[PDB]
Design a protein around this ligand. Sequence first.
Ligand SMILES: *[C@@H]1O[C@H](CO)[C@@H](O[C@@H]2O[C@H](CO)[C@@H](O)[C@H](O)[C@H]2NC(C)=O)[C@H](O)[C@H]1NC(C)=O
Ligand SMILES: *[C@@H]1O[C@H](CO)[C@@H](O[C@@H]2O[C@H](CO)[C@@H](O)[C@H](O)[C@H]2NC(C)=O)[C@H](O)[C@H]1NC(C)=O
Ligand SMILES: *[C@@H]1O[C@H](CO)[C@@H](O[C@@H]2O[C@H](CO)[C@@H](O)[C@H](O)[C@H]2NC(C)=O)[C@H](O)[C@H]1NC(C)=O
Ligand SMILES: *[C@@H]1O[C@H](CO)[C@@H](O[C@@H]2O[C@H](CO)[C@@H](O)[C@H](O)[C@H]2NC(C)=O)[C@H](O)[C@H]1NC(C)=O
Ligand code: NAG
Ligand code: CU
Ligand code: CU
Ligand code: CU
Ligand code: CU
Ligand code: CU
Ligand code: CU
Ligand code: CU
Ligand code: CU
Ligand code: CU
Ligand code: CU
Ligand code: CU
Ligand code: CU
Lengths: 495, 495, 495
Amino acid sequence: VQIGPVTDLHIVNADIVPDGFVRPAVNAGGTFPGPVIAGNVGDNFQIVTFNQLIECSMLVDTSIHWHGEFQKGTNWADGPAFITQCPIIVGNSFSYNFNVPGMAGTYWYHSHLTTQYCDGLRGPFVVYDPNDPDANLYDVDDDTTIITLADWYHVLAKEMGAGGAITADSTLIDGLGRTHVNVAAVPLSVITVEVGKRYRMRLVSISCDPNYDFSIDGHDMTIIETDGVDSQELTVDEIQIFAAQRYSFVLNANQPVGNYWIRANPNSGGEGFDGGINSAILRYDGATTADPVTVASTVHTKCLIETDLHPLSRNGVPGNPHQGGADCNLNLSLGFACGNFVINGVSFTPPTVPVLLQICSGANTAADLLPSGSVISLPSNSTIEIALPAGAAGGPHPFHLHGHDFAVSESASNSTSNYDDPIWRDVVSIGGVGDNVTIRFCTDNPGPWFLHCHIDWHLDAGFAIVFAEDIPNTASANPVPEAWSNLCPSYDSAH
Amino acid sequence: VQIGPVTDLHIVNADIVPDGFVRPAVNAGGTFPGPVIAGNVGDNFQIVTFNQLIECSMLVDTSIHWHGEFQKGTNWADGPAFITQCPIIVGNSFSYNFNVPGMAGTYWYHSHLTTQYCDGLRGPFVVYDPNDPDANLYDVDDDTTIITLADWYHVLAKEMGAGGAITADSTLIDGLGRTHVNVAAVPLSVITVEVGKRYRMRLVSISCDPNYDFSIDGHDMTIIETDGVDSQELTVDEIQIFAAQRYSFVLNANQPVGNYWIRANPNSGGEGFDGGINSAILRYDGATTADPVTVASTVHTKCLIETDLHPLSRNGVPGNPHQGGADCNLNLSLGFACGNFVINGVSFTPPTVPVLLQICSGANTAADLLPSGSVISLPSNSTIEIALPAGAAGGPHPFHLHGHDFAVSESASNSTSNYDDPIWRDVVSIGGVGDNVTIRFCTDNPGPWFLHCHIDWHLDAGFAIVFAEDIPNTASANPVPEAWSNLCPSYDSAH
Amino acid sequence: VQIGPVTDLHIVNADIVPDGFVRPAVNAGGTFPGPVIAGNVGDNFQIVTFNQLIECSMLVDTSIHWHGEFQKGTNWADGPAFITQCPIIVGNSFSYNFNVPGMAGTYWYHSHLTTQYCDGLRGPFVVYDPNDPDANLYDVDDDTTIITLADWYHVLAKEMGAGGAITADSTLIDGLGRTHVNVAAVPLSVITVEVGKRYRMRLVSISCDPNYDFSIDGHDMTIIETDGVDSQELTVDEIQIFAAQRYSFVLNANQPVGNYWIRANPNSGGEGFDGGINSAILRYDGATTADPVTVASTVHTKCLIETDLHPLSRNGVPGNPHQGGADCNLNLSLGFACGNFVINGVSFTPPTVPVLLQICSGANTAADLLPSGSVISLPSNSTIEIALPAGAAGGPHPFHLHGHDFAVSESASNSTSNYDDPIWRDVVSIGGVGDNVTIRFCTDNPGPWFLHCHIDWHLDAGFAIVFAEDIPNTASANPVPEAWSNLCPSYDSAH
Ligand SMILES: *[C@@H]1O[C@H](CO)[C@@H](O[C@@H]2O[C@H](CO)[C@@H](O)[C@H](O)[C@H]2NC(C)=O)[C@H](O)[C@H]1NC(C)=O
Ligand SMILES: *[C@@H]1O[C@H](CO)[C@@H](O[C@@H]2O[C@H](CO)[C@@H](O)[C@H](O)[C@H]2NC(C)=O)[C@H](O)[C@H]1NC(C)=O
Ligand SMILES: *[C@@H]1O[C@H](CO)[C@@H](O[C@@H]2O[C@H](CO)[C@@H](O)[C@H](O)[C@H]2NC(C)=O)[C@H](O)[C@H]1NC(C)=O
Ligand SMILES: *[C@@H]1O[C@H](CO)[C@@H](O[C@@H]2O[C@H](CO)[C@@H](O)[C@H](O)[C@H]2NC(C)=O)[C@H](O)[C@H]1NC(C)=O
Ligand SMILES: *[C@@H]1O[C@H](CO)[C@@H](O)[C@H](O)[C@H]1NC(C)=O
Ligand SMILES: [Cu+2]
Ligand SMILES: [Cu+2]
Ligand SMILES: [Cu+2]
Ligand SMILES: [Cu+2]
Ligand SMILES: [Cu+2]
Ligand SMILES: [Cu+2]
Ligand SMILES: [Cu+2]
Ligand SMILES: [Cu+2]
Ligand SMILES: [Cu+2]
Ligand SMILES: [Cu+2]
Ligand SMILES: [Cu+2]
Ligand SMILES: [Cu+2]
């Protein structure tokens, strides 16, 4: 079901049993996954978030991030607690009001307070484009062509465990899927197609942790979008999708009418598809309603490799075509030891005053911002290159940057850089020990933008810092509403 | 489950997944459908409604209607919000204390606040008859023979629609069914029978909108009751049942021990029975526990027609064996334009003071009453006749009158009136353009009686007017308890 | 999932549908059953119970008992409402803080307010012994090898009438099972085993009422533990387990790879296994994922007889070898009349002031303690014998004593006493008219200890007395935290 772009979104607690095991959840709009929030390019989004949360086992405060949306001019609507706002307290509401100029594709929203999105607050977010360059490549693009991949846990997020060393208890495709241990025969999701039709499947990883090896028996997948970035057509028979990433692929339903297994194997937890775990069903209209009996290819032949991807626009790459050919050029020491993650020797722990507020309240630099050693300023209007060399356990770590997308100049498991036509995206696997995954972008977006591993467990163990982009232009660039001013006083009073 | 006639009924929010899709709901008695409320003819019903609702997305006020109960002398207990009461606000309770003289059969209860009953607050209501004139036509008449047909939506009622055609997402029979799009193989309701026994099936439409074509593969159905009214035995192989109607039929379990599909095909929403949508299972004790493999008749051969129904008692018709032959005969103009329905040029919008309250406060005439043009007065001890010509989009509209049942002198799709032995009921389909459905009853029940289309979407869009019957005797006829008197000040103060 | 020995435990309302019928529940830790609370022998348990209950229909107060934990020194933490504490009110927490010296084995926890544990608040409690003498008898002992058996009702406990014979609507094994009437094909629990491994299976009855005949097609069970007491190895092929009892049994997975039914026939409610009621699935790794087609042995040849159990340690028996061979020997007259149970002519009805507070406020004798005639004082360091002659309306009644385990000197259906080597346990069936089931313990545990039938409906109808053990020393032995003292003032104020 789709909303808005002008919509109420209630946040409530409910018990759900997607794999047959009832446990409490945090829900956005009352469903798991949450409803699809949607509009067109350049629509004004006004999302009135009513916090009705009562079950403190999962926190009764909340804060919501719109994942992949630049929020230029509206950094205050971005969502990461203590980076851009204080949480909303229960009984209160907050209008997240923002535009999406110049963006279209497949995104998602989620809780961005501690590990709460694991406990259920996550759903798809799609910016349709009436003049979408890829539109003529399929027949159907609607709510029935969104595929969500979710890790699901029998253990309350607040009670793990971290880090960790945390594993899921099932994979849910479109909110349904079977339990890894003592698999009960619970309902599986169905995705229906009609012969001769072509489908823009919008694959959204709403994972708190694992990446999935995603494949559809008997069928190929032509990638056309990645993390909201339109791509040159690339046909693959399997896609490894890391936490928070999105792909749009054309499914051409050109196989005999019948039932085929939809497959999503995660890097951790249950291995295989016994009992129908890690599965959903692709069904042709007119097929017998039964489980598929198909098998995967013995060896997948055109597996997705990130260096095979290039933008549909001529995006090029900002800066100079050599290792470090950028203005401000960073290289981060990403580490782990004693149950905590570090970036440049510092584990992230949220400040009492949201970075955005510190800035709004007079901070000029840089050295003025809390937490010390967890904020890096970026000069206005500048090529930034970030190297994120791998090694820290574990891994592989999908890094994400708020308020931007970035050219992926060097991907995982391949030391050959690309300064011509690399894919731009917003979340990237930093690969394995030895790798030197590197990104470039331009600072056209004043404000504090979170940079973190997107494995939520590791974010909670402090794998993060803040790019405080153009500090001095941060207040003129982001006027805040009164209601945002009211957040931190309400929250501090409440706690 | 059965209660009362004396009972508590708590109204709460819960998420439920009747077709495998979790969403929020508004439940009476904590279950979907609500528990069966039951007692004997003549019983005093005492039903303490506790409002414990908190999810504002479906409204936290409520008001409950006991559909088909005449409510003589207890007009204040009727339930339609702003006609007979202000809603009960959350944290409060209200005793609906009323009696059922001279009524016995199959009824239901529902929220009668906005479209709240679509969100879950619907349940069967049954008045048993220790001397039921049909008791010897069956062996078993209990909670396991009640069959509810319900439309079910993935979109919250307050976010429809509207109007705006609106369509359901699954059919639920006894609270379970499978979704119309990307149907997941979720559990289906089973009804059990034993060879040689006869069952009073109490078929209840708790629908917000669609009518159903109901059938059981391999079985005939002998109708013995219509909307509370005992009928002569009419055997049919299909029953088209409109929103809010009820039928008791005898099922004779005379077939070979096995599994038989129960079928209920809505007039809008998913068509057919693929993957077991629009279906439940009739099982003989001793059958292999397996899905049925039966098929419906190619052509139904004794489909129910309303003119073939006749009261079991000689009821006759009030007034004159010709058209317009009543003390006080009305012909309503029923229209639709600009997303609203109108009755005699006026679209119903709820008053601020409930109609019963304005009467109790001095009001004397329809001119005196709010809403303006939305009230028609009726003189006491008269034969009313109401012609309800069809044609308004989008039929067919099931029109319902509170506080009464009526003789249907002219039915759908047939211009031949019947002033002899027409069936009496309380909810009648007005058919299609050209039809002139007409009803007669007698004014022996002072108070404000709602008259509306029972498609809830159409009622919220204005398809109603109020018959204020015997205004002058209303106050003395219906003494009100203090708790009713408190409802409006409490409600007004809350809002 | 496992939590503890130090943990939060939130008590919330949630609708659940374990047999496909949605209804309201009172949940501990958000699941049904509750999470397993675990620790090692000698550990300090600190369970913070957050009462977040809102649904009045099942009571918003609550109070938890740790069934079979002796609570020596901590009688205030025991949990029975109005015996050792007042209920925690909604919105408050309370810290159950206690140790388990000397004890190991399989226990459980539940609401001990009114009939609330029926409504969901139940879960297993395991004390692991790192030097368990039974360790070498098996390979696998963990959360996957706990098996709960639970009766489940469609009727909310508070509405059960009462008593009034009462019957469940399904049997749930590990929280899943099928309804007895109009059985829907809803998911069944699976217990997975690997060819050639031995399992410590922890069978726990969390029943409100029925006793189960428990068995596993094709397999033996070697009993090694009974209600916490290590036992000599006893191979049986069926186990009658009465409400609140526990057994650990070794299952040798020695049959061919396949699916085998696990059976739990309740002594009332649905009879047999038609459609998979009273059923769960034993699945071997490698078996096809399908319903077992196994059959129970026609006659079970080595079913559990309680007189066959002997302690593993040399517990022997206190006192002297003949009836009355104790310091303080009691014979309780157990009756039922007009819907209430009596113990020595008195029917238990909860006092306004909790028994332990009565003592703490300076009561010195049973005569001084309310309710009048519902208290029997015991002297310290004395051998107690309690005869519990059956005959009272159904029956068979499982009696349980708080703060103690006890030698079962005489078992049901067998009039021979055993004063050498009988099993010790904490819940015991008193059998049938004519029986004289007899227990013995020593009084080394100052405090008021509940003795009641563990059929909860029978407890609410009054089948209980309090053993006020060493009243003089009770206050000194049981120092209370301010929080406990805060309980009654809150409760009484709220009500
Ligand atoms: C049209 O409605 C009329 C009005 O009731 C129905 O008329 C009855 O039909 C049967 C046919 O023998 C007769 O027994 C009666 O004489 C008719 N009743 C009266 C009161 O005249 C007729 O059934 C309907 N037509 C159709 C085609 O269903
Ligand atoms: C439907 O039937 C009603 C009868 O109650 C008709 O009523 C009258 O019909 C005469 C025509 O002979 C006209 O004077 C009016 O149009 C009607 N008014 C009254 C008060 O009788 C009505 O005409 C019929 N209408 C339709 C739409 O079929
Ligand atoms: C069961 O056992 C008890 C004793 O353990 C029996 O109680 C005896 O009862 C008789 C008559 O009631 C008294 O004279 C004795 O004093 C009791 N003996 C003792 C030692 O107290 C009781 O009768 C038995 N009940 C049965 C068999 O129903
Ligand atoms: C009834 O109870 C008695 C008491 O335990 C059981 O008698 C024991 O029987 C075993 C072997 O049959 C002997 O080793 C013991 O000497 C008996 N013990 C005592 C203490 O007498 C008896 O077996 C039980 N009856 C049944 C049918 O099981
Ligand atoms: C990664 O590449 C960067 C280029 O900016 C280089 O400075 C650094 O030494 C490299 N580290 C590793 C581990 O390759
Ligand atoms: Cu994100
Ligand atoms: Cu983001
Ligand atoms: Cu990481
Ligand atoms: Cu983030
Ligand atoms: Cu109605
Ligand atoms: Cu009505
Ligand atoms: Cu209508
Ligand atoms: Cu109405
Ligand atoms: Cu207990
Ligand atoms: Cu106990
Ligand atoms: Cu009992
Ligand atoms: Cu107890």
